Write a protein that binds this ligand. Structure first.
Ligand SMILES: CCCCCCCC/C=C\CCCCCCCC(=O)O[C@H](COC(=O)CCCCCCCCCCCCCCC)COP(=O)([O-])OCC[N+](C)(C)C
Ligand SMILES: CCCCCCCC/C=C\CCCCCCCC(=O)O[C@H](COC(=O)CCCCCCCCCCCCCCC)COP(=O)([O-])OCC[N+](C)(C)C
Ligand SMILES: CCCCCCCC/C=C\CCCCCCCC(=O)O[C@H](COC(=O)CCCCCCCCCCCCCCC)COP(=O)([O-])OCC[N+](C)(C)C
Ligand SMILES: CCCCCCCC/C=C\CCCCCCCC(=O)O[C@H](COC(=O)CCCCCCCCCCCCCCC)COP(=O)([O-])OCC[N+](C)(C)C
Ligand SMILES: CCCCCCCC/C=C\CCCCCCCC(=O)O[C@H](COC(=O)CCCCCCCCCCCCCCC)COP(=O)(O)OC[C@H](O)CO
Ligand SMILES: CCCCCCCC/C=C\CCCCCCCC(=O)O[C@H](COC(=O)CCCCCCCCCCCCCCC)COP(=O)(O)OC[C@H](O)CO
Ligand SMILES: CCCCCCCC/C=C\CCCCCCCC(=O)O[C@H](COC(=O)CCCCCCCCCCCCCCC)COP(=O)(O)OCCN
Ligand SMILES: CCCCCCCC/C=C\CCCCCCCC(=O)O[C@H](COC(=O)CCCCCCCCCCCCCCC)COP(=O)(O)OCCN
Ligand SMILES: COc1cc(CNC(=O)CCCC/C=C/C(C)C)ccc1O
Ligand SMILES: COc1cc(CNC(=O)CCCC/C=C/C(C)C)ccc1O
Lengths: 596, 289
């Protein structure tokens, strides 16, 4: 009976097995009898698995037993042995490896490790098991296996990293060991370019998902072993004393097939855990600073100058808007009017430019709706200024004078938007970052609270007035009480009230609660937030400049796309495949006195 | 054992220890008796007392207790349901954490008069945090939002029926045949109904909790305000049938209070609840000094 043998194996006794073996020979889940024996094993107390194997052999298609249910679909015995650290059991099963565990857990709570025994072992901090499996004799495990979505062993290794120092420790370690092992077994294959269905290199994924430690690893990797020197991503070009001159790979850091590591870091939607901190590695900092110094500083300054001219001409053509009658207007023969029409045309041209730029940005990036004001606070503003200018365009040919109520808005926005350009000047870029952050947090909170209070006490005071000028108004009373917050409040601004004591108690309560208590609270909270973000501001500014550089290079590929490339094409060492290692490497310097 | 705990790390150390040893000993001698439910004249379980008096370390112990010994596995308050790799799925007991005979551990922590040393810190344990967050997510978020919306409507109608108060003569007033006046009488009736509701709620609260007199403005800064708004509204009720025009000097106060009291509802939004807490604390300390 199946139940009897299940209890026997759970009983850790072979009496039932021996008793039923002669009789059996004479004669949703589907868990295997050997699987049941292994499962109910303590200190290796399960020995019926070997007997089951011998009986099955004496009587291939069964050593490959697997689940049938969708909950544990495909759970593999070798996988279970790996979960148990089973050297004896796993070695027996393999001797007696590409199993696909495509179930729910392998795809609420669960564990993702890949779908292959080799991947599971690598995801369990067990190195002897992986050595044996990948180089097992009966059937060695192939390292280049790619699962359904394409996550290979390295892909899962990265996918399980969690940035914690020990986790970084052994993820980096085992990544290195598996890499060098695959290199020794296959000097011909290059594993890194292996990409999943999304087509992400392990570097690209370790950077996009946000795993920083593995990133610093992959960009700072070097090997001296003569046979596999050709896995290194760093080299030390020379050294006389404490001075060292070293290289870096830039394999596809700067420009890569579809998205390089930089292009992924910058345009990451900030759903990524930590992108601002991530440009602290050495090659990236050096690279971005080099690009800024060489050939994009001039472009950014020129862009800033052109925007200054556009604001100036827009301002001076808005200042002298015709006032005679209604729009549109006839062009008088004077010269000043010709100048003014030139100003209007340049103005609308700039407006349409910004409008399109905004649409193109919103098509390429496709930004979300719940985090649009925390990822891109500047593209919104430029596009909004463009929208107001274009609505003015629309209503200046609709014979209507209201266009100004739009255009004015635009113009104000215009000048304010100039702060966008203070990111090329670190010491002002950090200030503009603080403005952005405070406007998003502190004005919003304090303004909900302050409007609660203002409206409360303003209806309170209007329900009392009688008008027996026109203070019987919620708008004029809303003002007369708002002025108390700019130090222009008149405690006796009306005598059309029934009760003076009540009126004065109300205004005094209002001044104490908003002017004295709240507003000073806002000052205190601004102090707190500044003292906290003094550094997040620096990181965000560096990221702002990095994005500037990327957009700058992408847009002006037309003028000289490959002219200003990072680093130079250098020959660093020999590789067995072709005995030549040419790479777009980037040289940097360094020193150290402790090492000698 | 609980009564002598003093939250100091070594004191927690040996109180927890000896509690465990005496418990397992009594279990071995008497597998039939269940000692924990033994309650004093006040009827407090050792858990309930360790929580009410404020002893946190012993609390974290009692709620995170587990035993593997086969004979006395049945003293555990925690279990580990399964584990494949670094993942573990575990349980918790909720013996009478959520709902208990007369007062559970939560019901004691929350309604503690703040004469307790540390109640705010005490909801840091694992089962309590998980439990309360789960309740918020599942089936009380909707109720709280609906309550907030109803209060918004009450303030709006109160405001718009106070705005257009009749000015012709003195109170009371005859109901003109117009439709707007019928709308306005509907507004006044809804207003006073809400007022009496808040008044009773306040009285019931003050009967159940029975709050002290020296710490009433530091334990419940919000029930006072809602009840006070109700009082002003009801005094307006009284003086609008006493042929007197002073009712407004009362009603106005109420209305202002009304809108301000809306801040009471910004505790369902962490990032504004913390701001309203700061307002409360500063008004009690710094404006006073
Ligand atoms: C293009 C430029 C237009 C930008 C501002 C010009 C607005 C004048 C239109 C108008 O009616 O204004 C009159 C005053 O305008 C003046 O008298 C000032 C003219 C001096 C400007 C010369 C520099 C051009 C070099 C570039 C007011 O009537
Ligand atoms: C001048 C009218 C509009 C130009 C403003 C503009 O595009 O901003 C300049 C670009 O302008 C140019 O680089 C085009 C310059 C060619 C025009 C020459 C013809 C003059 C006769 C500034 O560059 P920009 O990048 O627009 O920065 C503004 C903010 N965004 C668009 C980056 C978000
Ligand atoms: C119940 C609602 C009462 C709340 C405010 C209504 C006060 C009006 C009384 C009065 O004398 O005001 C007159 C103006 O009142 C108006 O002309 C505004 C009426 C529009 C309101 C319709 C929405 C109802 C849907 C719900 C002023 O005289
Ligand atoms: C509306 C008149 C008064 C309601 C205001 C009120 O009770 O606050 C609502 C409850 O209201 C209700 O949940 C009752 C809703 C039933 C009324 C339907 C009939 C309409 C026709 C808000 O809930 P609440 O808990 O009163 O919160 C306010 C402050 N305390 C009372 C929690 C301290
Ligand atoms: C507007 C200008 C605001 C200047 C901010 C002060 C500051 O400190 O910036 C430092 C400035 O950089 C430079 O040397 C290069 C300066 C080039 C100026 C920008 C060119 C375009 C100017 C627009 C037209 C205005 C002309 C008005 C004069 C007739 C370095 O800062 P940092 O190295 O990043 O630290
Ligand atoms: C008044 C609304 C004030 C909002 C504060 C901003 C904030 O940040 O709160 C976040 C908001 O939550 C939500 O998603 C649910 C939002 C549900 C809104 C409340 C429902 C009733 C509104 C009253 C009626 C006004 C309608 C006016 C429009 C015509 C989460 O915060 P968190 O997760 O706790 O951190
Ligand atoms: C805090 C945030 C809430 C922001 C929304 C406030 C908008 C109030 C609109 C307003 O002031 O309406 C004015 C006041 O109208 C009222 O009396 C409505 C009162 C309801 C207030 C609740 C909002 C219009 O004046 P009128 O004499 O009715 O014509
Ligand atoms: C959020 C801040 C909003 C600011 C916008 C203010 C302009 C809105 C004007 C709309 C109606 C209007 O013409 O204004 C007047 C007011 O009309 C109304 O009833 C609107 C009532 C809303 C008042 C709340 C605004 C106070 C904010 C101050 C800070 C028209 O009549 P009058 O000139 O008062 O006599
Ligand atoms: C545009 O990029 C940035 C801009 C700013 C400063 N700009 C603002 O704060 C916008 C102000 C909008 C108020 C305009 C109101 C009109 C209706 C009169 C800081 C950081 C940036 O990155
Ligand atoms: C109601 O619950 C809360 C309310 C608040 C804000 N409310 C207040 O500060 C009350 C203001 C009372 C002043 C009124 C004066 C009249 C006479 C005009 C903060 C936290 C809360 O928990």
């Amino acid at each position: 009976d199946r139940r009897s043998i299940f209890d026997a194996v759970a009983q850790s006794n072979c009496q039932e097995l021996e008793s039923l073996l002669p009789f059996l020979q004479r004669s949703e889940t589907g868990k295997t009898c050997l699987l049941k024996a292994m499962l109910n094993l303590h200190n290796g107390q399960n020995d019926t698995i070997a007997l089951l194997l011998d009986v099955a052999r004496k009587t291939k298609q069964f050593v490959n037993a697997s689940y049938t249910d969708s909950y544990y679909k495909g759970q593999t015995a070798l996988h279970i042995a790996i979960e148990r650290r089973n050297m004896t059991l796993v070695t027996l099963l393999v001797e007696n490896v590409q199993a696909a565990a495509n179930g729910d857990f392998f795809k609420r709570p669960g564990f993702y490790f890949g779908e292959l025994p080799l991947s599971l072992a690598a995801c369990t901090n067990q190195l002897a098991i992986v050595k044996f499996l990948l180089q097992n004799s009966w059937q060695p495990a192939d390292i280049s296996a790619r699962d359904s979505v394409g996550n290979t062993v390295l892909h899962a290794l990265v996918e399980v990293a969690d940035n914690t120092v020990d986790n970084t420790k052994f993820v980096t370690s085992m990544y290195n060991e598996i890499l060098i092992l695959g290199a020794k077994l296959h000097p011909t294959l290059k594993l890194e370019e292996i990409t999943n269905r999304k087509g992400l290199t392990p570097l690209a994924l370790a950077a996009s998902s946000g795993k920083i430690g593995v990133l610093a690893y992959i960009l700072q990797r070097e090997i001296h072993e003569p046979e596999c020197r050709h896995l290194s991503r760093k080299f030390t070009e020379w050294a006389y004393g404490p001075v060292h001159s070293s290289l870096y790979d830039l394999s596809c850091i700067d420009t890569c097939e579809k998205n390089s590591v930089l292009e992924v870091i910058a345009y990451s939607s900030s759903e990524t855990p930590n992108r601002h901190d991530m440009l602290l590695v050495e090659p990236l900092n050096r690279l971005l600073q080099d690009k800024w110094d060489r050939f994009v500083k001039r472009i950014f300054y020129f862009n800033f100058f052109v925007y200054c001219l556009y604001m100036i001409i827009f301002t001076a053509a808005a200042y002298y808007r015709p006032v005679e009658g209604l729009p549109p207007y006839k062009l008088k023969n004077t010269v000043g009017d010709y100048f003014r029409v030139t100003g209007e045309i340049l103005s609308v041209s700039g407006g349409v430019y910004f409008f399109f730029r905004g649409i193109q940005y919103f098509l390429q990036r496709r930004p979300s709706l719940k985090s649009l004001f925390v990822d891109s606070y500047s593209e919104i503003l430029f596009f909004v200024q463009s929208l107001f200018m274009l609505v003015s365009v629309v209503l200046y040919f609709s014979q209507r004078k209201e266009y100004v109520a739009s255009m004015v808005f635009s113009l104000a926005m215009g000048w304010t938007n100039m702060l966008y350009y203070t990111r090329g000047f670190q010491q002002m870029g950090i200030y503009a970052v603080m403005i952005e952050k405070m406007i998003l947090r502190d004005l919003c909170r304090f303004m909900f609270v302050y409007l609660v209070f203002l409206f409360g006490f303003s209806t309170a005071v209007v329900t009392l007035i009688e008008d027996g000028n026109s203070y019987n108004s919620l708008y004029s009373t809303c003002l007369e009480l708002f002025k108390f917050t700019i130090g222009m409040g008149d405690l006796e601004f009306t005598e059309n009230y029934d009760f003076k004591a009540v009126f004065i108690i109300l205004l005094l309560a209002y001044v104490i609660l908003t002017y004295i208590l709240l507003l000073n609270m806002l000052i205190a909270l601004m102090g707190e937030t500044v003292n906290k973000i003094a550094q997040e501001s620096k990181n965000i500014w560096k990221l702002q400049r990095a994005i500037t550089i990327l957009d700058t290079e992408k847009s002006f590929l037309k003028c000289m796309r490959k002219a200003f490339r990072s680093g130079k094409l250098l020959q660093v060492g020999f590789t067995p495949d072709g005995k030549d290692d040419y790479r777009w490497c980037f040289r940097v310097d360094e020193v150290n006195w402790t090492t000698w």
